[PDB]
Amino acid sequence: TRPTVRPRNDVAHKQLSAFGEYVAEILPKYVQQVQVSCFNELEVCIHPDGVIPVLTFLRDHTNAQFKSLVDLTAVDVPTRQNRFEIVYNLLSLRFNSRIRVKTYTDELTPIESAVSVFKAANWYEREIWDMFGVFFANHPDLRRILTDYGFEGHPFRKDFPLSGYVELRYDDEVKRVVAEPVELAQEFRKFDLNSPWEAFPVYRQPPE
Amino acid sequence: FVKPIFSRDMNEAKRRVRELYRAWYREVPNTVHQFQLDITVKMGRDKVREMFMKNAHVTDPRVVDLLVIKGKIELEETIKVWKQRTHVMRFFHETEAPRPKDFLSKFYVGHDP
Amino acid sequence: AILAAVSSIAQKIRMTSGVTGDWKVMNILHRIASQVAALDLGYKPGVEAIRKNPPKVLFLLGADGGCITRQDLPKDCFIIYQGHHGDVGAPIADVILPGAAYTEKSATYVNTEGRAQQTKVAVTPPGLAREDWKIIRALSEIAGMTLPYDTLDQVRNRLEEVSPNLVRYDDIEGANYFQQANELSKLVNQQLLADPLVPPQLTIKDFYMTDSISRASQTMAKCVKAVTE
Amino acid sequence: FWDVDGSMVPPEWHRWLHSMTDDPPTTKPLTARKFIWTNHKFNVTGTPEQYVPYSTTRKKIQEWIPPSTPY
Amino acid sequence: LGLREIRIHLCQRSPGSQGVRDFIEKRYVELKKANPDLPILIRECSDVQPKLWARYAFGQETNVPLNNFSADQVTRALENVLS
Amino acid sequence: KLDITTLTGVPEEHIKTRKVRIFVPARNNMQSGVNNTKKWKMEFDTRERWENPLMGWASTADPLSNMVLTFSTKEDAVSFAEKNGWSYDIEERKVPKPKSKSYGANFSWNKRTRVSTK
Amino acid sequence: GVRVSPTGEKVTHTGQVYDDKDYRRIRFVGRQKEVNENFAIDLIAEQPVSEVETRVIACDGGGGALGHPKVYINLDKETKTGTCGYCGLQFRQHH
Amino acid sequence: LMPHGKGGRSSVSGIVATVFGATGFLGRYVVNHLGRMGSQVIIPYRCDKYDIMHLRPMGDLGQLLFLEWDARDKDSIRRVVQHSNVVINLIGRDWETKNFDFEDVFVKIPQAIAQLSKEAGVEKFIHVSHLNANIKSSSRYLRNKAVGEKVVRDAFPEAIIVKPSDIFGREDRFLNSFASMHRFGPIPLGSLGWKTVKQPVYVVDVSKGIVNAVKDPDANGKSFAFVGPSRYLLFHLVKYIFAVAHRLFLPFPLPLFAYRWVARVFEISPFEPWITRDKVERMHITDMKLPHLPGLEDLGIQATPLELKAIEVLRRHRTYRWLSAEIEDVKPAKTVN
Numbered sequence A: 001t002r003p004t005v006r007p008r009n010d011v012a013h014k015q016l017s018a019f020g021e022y023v024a025e026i027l028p029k030y031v032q033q034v035q036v037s038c039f040n041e042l043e044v045c046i047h048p049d050g051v052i053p054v055l056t057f058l059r060d061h062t063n064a065q066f067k068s069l070v071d072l073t074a075v076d077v078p079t080r081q082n083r084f085e086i087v088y089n090l091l092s093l094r095f096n097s098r099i100r101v102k103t104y105t106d107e108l109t110p111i112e113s114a115v116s117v118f119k120a121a122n123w124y125e126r127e128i129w130d131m132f133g134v135f136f137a138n139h140p141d142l143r144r145i146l147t148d149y150g151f152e153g154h155p156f157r158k159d160f161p162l163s164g165y166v167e168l169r170y171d172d173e174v175k176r177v178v179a180e181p182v183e184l185a186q187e188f189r190k191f192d193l194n195s196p197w198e199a200f201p202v203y204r205q206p207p208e
Numbered sequence B: 001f002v003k004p005i006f007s008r009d010m011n012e013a014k015r016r017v018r019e020l021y022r023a024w025y026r027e028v029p030n031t032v033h034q035f036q037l038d039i040t041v042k043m044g045r046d047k048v049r050e051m052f053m054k055n056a057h058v059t060d061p062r063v064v065d066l067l068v069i070k071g072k073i074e075l076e077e078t079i080k081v082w083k084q085r086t087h088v089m090r091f092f093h094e095t096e097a098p099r100p101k102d103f104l105s106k107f108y109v110g111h112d113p
Numbered sequence C: 001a002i003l004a005a006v007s008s009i010a011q012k013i014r015m016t017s018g019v020t021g022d023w024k025v026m027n028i029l030h031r032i033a034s035q036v037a038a039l040d041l042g043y044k045p046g047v048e049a050i051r052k053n054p055p056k057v058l059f060l061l062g063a064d065g066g067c068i069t070r071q072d073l074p075k076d077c078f079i080i081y082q083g084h085h086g087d088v089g090a091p092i093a094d095v096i097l098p099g100a101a102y103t104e105k106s107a108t109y110v111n112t113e114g115r116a117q118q119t120k121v122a123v124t125p126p127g128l129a130r131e132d133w134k135i136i137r138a139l140s141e142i143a144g145m146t147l148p149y150d151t152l153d154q155v156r157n158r159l160e161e162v163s164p165n166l167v168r169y170d171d172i173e174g175a176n177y178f179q180q181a182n183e184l185s186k187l188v189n190q191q192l193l194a195d196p197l198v199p200p201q202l203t204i205k206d207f208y209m210t211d212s213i214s215r216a217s218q219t220m221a222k223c224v225k226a227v228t229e
Numbered sequence D: 001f002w003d004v005d006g007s008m009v010p011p012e013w014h015r016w017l018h019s020m021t022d023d024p025p026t027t028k029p030l031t032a033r034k035f036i037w038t039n040h041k042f043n044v045t046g047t048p049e050q051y052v053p054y055s056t057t058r059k060k061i062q063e064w065i066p067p068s069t070p071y
Numbered sequence E: 001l002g003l004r005e006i007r008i009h010l011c012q013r014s015p016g017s018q019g020v021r022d023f024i025e026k027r028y029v030e031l032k033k034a035n036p037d038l039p040i041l042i043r044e045c046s047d048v049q050p051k052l053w054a055r056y057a058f059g060q061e062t063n064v065p066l067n068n069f070s071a072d073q074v075t076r077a078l079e080n081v082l083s
Numbered sequence F: 001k002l003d004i005t006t007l008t009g010v011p012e013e014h015i016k017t018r019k020v021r022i023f024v025p026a027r028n029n030m031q032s033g034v035n036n037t038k039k040w041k042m043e044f045d046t047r048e049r050w051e052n053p054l055m056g057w058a059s060t061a062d063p064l065s066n067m068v069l070t071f072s073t074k075e076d077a078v079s080f081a082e083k084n085g086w087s088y089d090i091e092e093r094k095v096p097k098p099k100s101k102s103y104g105a106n107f108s109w110n111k112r113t114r115v116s117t118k
Numbered sequence G: 001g002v003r004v005s006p007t008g009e010k011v012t013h014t015g016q017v018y019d020d021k022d023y024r025r026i027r028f029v030g031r032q033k034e035v036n037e038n039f040a041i042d043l044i045a046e047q048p049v050s051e052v053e054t055r056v057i058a059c060d061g062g063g064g065a066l067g068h069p070k071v072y073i074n075l076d077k078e079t080k081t082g083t084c085g086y087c088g089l090q091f092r093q094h095h
Numbered sequence H: 001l002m003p004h005g006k007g008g009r010s011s012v013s014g015i016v017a018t019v020f021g022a023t024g025f026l027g028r029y030v031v032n033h034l035g036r037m038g039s040q041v042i043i044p045y046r047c048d049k050y051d052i053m054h055l056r057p058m059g060d061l062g063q064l065l066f067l068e069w070d071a072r073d074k075d076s077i078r079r080v081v082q083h084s085n086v087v088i089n090l091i092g093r094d095w096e097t098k099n100f101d102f103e104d105v106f107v108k109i110p111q112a113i114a115q116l117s118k119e120a121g122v123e124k125f126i127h128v129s130h131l132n133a134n135i136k137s138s139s140r141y142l143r144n145k146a147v148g149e150k151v152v153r154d155a156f157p158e159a160i161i162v163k164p165s166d167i168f169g170r171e172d173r174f175l176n177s178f179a180s181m182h183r184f185g186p187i188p189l190g191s192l193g194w195k196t197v198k199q200p201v202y203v204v205d206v207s208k209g210i211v212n213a214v215k216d217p218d219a220n221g222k223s224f225a226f227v228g229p230s231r232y233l234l235f236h237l238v239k240y241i242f243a244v245a246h247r248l249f250l251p252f253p254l255p256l257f258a259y260r261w262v263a264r265v266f267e268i269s270p271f272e273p274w275i276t277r278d279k280v281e282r283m284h285i286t287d288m289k290l291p292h293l294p295g296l297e298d299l300g301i302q303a304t305p306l307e308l309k310a311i312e313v314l315r316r317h318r319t320y321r322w323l324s325a326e327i328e329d330v331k332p333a334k335t336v337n
């Protein structure tokens, strides 16, 4: 229960918890869950219409100066209609604390841009615009990062093939590089390594 | 129901597209000369008319305005003399073989759907 | 004769009563994978007495050398074919037209219980083989009588305007016409009963070679030679 | 010579220049199993000797045999 | 030219099909008795409306829906399509 | 019908040519585990894949062919295929029907279960 | 001494040589098709069959953790040799 | 074999071409078109490995093959054509190489290729002459084609005889030479160009046409004669050439023999001439207007006008003052019809 096991830090869990109810007090209007795992990792909801007003508050001291948007990590789950799950990782430097505060959005919901508030999201912007289509409040430019020029796709939508539909090559008489239909050789020979028989009864969503 | 991107109802959106067409329609020769396209310029304007036709089934103003957002964003890369001649030619797919919509030929080709 | 006899038997057991009456006592075990759907479409009884004059009969599978052969027309032996294995039917035929195996096509099949269930695509036909009915729509398209539907989904759309049960899959259930109207024309005929009455398959050793795949399968040859000696 | 290169060395001595082994193969000659090569042909990308990748594992469906008999 | 195959469709339970159900349970033996040749295929399908296909020359087919029709009206259509 | 047919980057050809398949994946026959029957998933119909003239490799046609997608419910998957504009075919869940069982049911002279030596 | 194809090129140890009709054979032209001289097949049965008067045995492929996992070969039937599932080499119980 | 996959670089087709003349101008194009379809293509070569290196992109791994061979030897030709199902032929040389007399180029070699193709059981041996092939005292090279046309017509009787006229492309000898005259300065022409007329043929069309010709069972002994969209008179044609080159244009008459002498002065070089006594008459010859022979659209491919193709071919010559200039503004050359 020790040589392999990583010890559970109850203390920080206690402090983060208590601060968690503290914040739960402070912004009832958007804050929801106050998740607190044994990893010492706190988490909190925000409604997307509540993106900016919460985040600004975060930067300003209460007992945690949530300075430096370290990340706007993003996840797409097709099942939920609110398929997008934008996440604000954060770190109050003065208090050496860390927190994860996320949201959700639909394909045509103009979620608020923290560009005015953090500016670090001038690109967390355009990536998460481009890879997805998560339209953003008001940004100086929504021009694509990463993906090419005429490129139409939105990879990381967890949709359409990992190769994509596009596969460019130089061509002769046109004297120029041209995009072409894929035609993969050998093909990504995907292995379904999923295991029937649950190893974790403690979890397990009920059949209901 | 859900809150709109920009335009609400088609006319707030329809206003934006025309702004887009001219934004291309004037820009085209500039592109014809910056990249020295061998295409006759009317072909360019025709393609300009065509890409505005592929989006004919659009009916939600959020879809229209999001399409002109992305289309103006493409215009950004165009006007700033970004891209390359090849990228301009990607719209043409001229290297690719023509597709026979006729079913009989589709029979003759391969297994297909 | 056995038909009218057994119909009389099931009706008689209905006369015995104690039956719920919705029991649908009258039933049979088909061994064929195709006749049941053709009869859902009610094409014909399938009587072979027809094998008279017609030139240029078309072969769908044509796996048996029994029910049909080229003595039907002394003159022309011109006979079109669209099976997939070459066993039996193919050599007899001329101007052969190769076609798909079952896993490859998405074409449907009807269970004997009236259950409808389409095949789905797998490895696709090996070469110049294609979807079976597509050649038909091609010939008709050349014949000056092109079929209005295009996609296989659209021929399925046609099945609703005729079958109309092929469009529905898991729907075994229906109105069920009941033995009243059924029996009445059964008794307006009658046929002599006879001898003998023997199952086609007899024993295990004969069970290994039926259709072109079961026939041509090598495991079947090894297995039948196993059950022999 | 005036065309010398790598791959000219034998595999035992090939282990020796790289100093994987302090001891030259002289002192410890290797297993010398029957199927290993002896001349050591070195790399040959040009010239008529030349590796060719190719299809392996024969056939698939075995296309149907046409009749030889007329009629 | 008058017919080659004729066929009908019928909801298993619907009120608009019920009189037709009663009909097939009765007179269908008579009409079927009338025509040893031309099939009168019948289907149980719970398609939203009861239906009447009737092929003529070169595969052309009439198609009268049987929704909200009494069996007498059904027959009334039936003699009409004898040819 | 909130189509995102243009909002997605997909070629029109792949949305026209094919219907997708919504379903609930089957349990292994060769294995005991029921565990993957749970959670819906949708998968596109397979296409022909000619062999590579060299080295005998697979040479896939349609790029999208290996796609797979889990869903909490059936209406969920239907909603996705509707949002995305592809045609689909719904399929029912297949939980096995319960079977009464008992240790002694194997036995009893009258029931003709009996089994035999044990 | 690999069996020679009608075209004259040697067949692979997994026999599969191309048809005379086959255009693909053109690839080998101007070059050399390569096939291994040492078929393992001959070398399987080339070896003497080991025999032990005992019963159940345990092959390891020679070399502790330098070969196949330890395996217990049965010798219930003297009518046949006990070929390894790994080594491929036979065993028997002489008596 | 038979085609599989969507028609592209990785999809297969049964084609097994042996394109002689792949080293040259047209050959890289026809190889590009065979290769784009995913058909495998043999490419026999004599010039050197480096010369055709640029073709490597055109294929996909196994799709291309390279083979050295002597024209002088017959057996090598036998080896290269063995597995060929089709054998396209493009060997030629306008200026006539010294060591290999011009005669062989359209006589001995095409014939050996034809017989060996017959022994090979080639499904479709193919040969490419020219619209100006009917025997003429002018242009021995043009005269030689007629003999090659017939010998090929006999040794392999069902051979197609392609007759393209003045194909123009980026590397075309015919279009470029006219553009290259600005370096020359003055612009001689045999009695100007008013007497003679031409109907130049675009090359990508000729190539794709060769492909579709391979694809058509119907063609065999057919003697195809490719023709351009438009039948421009030669003088107004040069007008257009510098009209797009934007270079100074100073035409003048010059006697055909007198021009022939200067061409002879330019034939002295082992180094390849821009001007030759073949080129003289081959220019001065008119293009025959033939209707009876099969159309270009029989292959289903539309003719592409030179005006839609010229500026890309000639931008390299136009001066920086003009090198970046709009296309529409040159105004098209006058057509005889």
Ligand SMILES: NC(=O)C1=CN([C@@H]2O[C@H](COP(=O)(O)OP(=O)(O)OC[C@H]3O[C@@H](n4cnc5c(N)ncnc54)[C@H](OP(=O)(O)O)[C@@H]3O)[C@@H](O)[C@H]2O)C=CC1
Binding pocket: H020, H021, H022, H023, H024, H025, H026, H027, H046, H047, H071, H090, H091, H092, H093, H094, H100, H105, H128, H129, H130, H131, H163, H164, H165, H166, H167, H168, H172, H173, H174
């Ligand atoms: N506009 C035009 O150019 C027209 C051309 N034609 C005819 O069609 C053919 C194609 O023209 P094009 O490809 O432009 O001419 P090219 O000179 O470009 O093509 C000929 C190629 O074949 C090679 N070749 C031929 N014979 C030999 C030999 N004996 N030894 C070594 N190399 C040889 C040449 O040299 P290597 O391969 O060694 O480098 C060259 O690569 C020509 O034969 C021409 O007469 C007809 C009408 C119009």
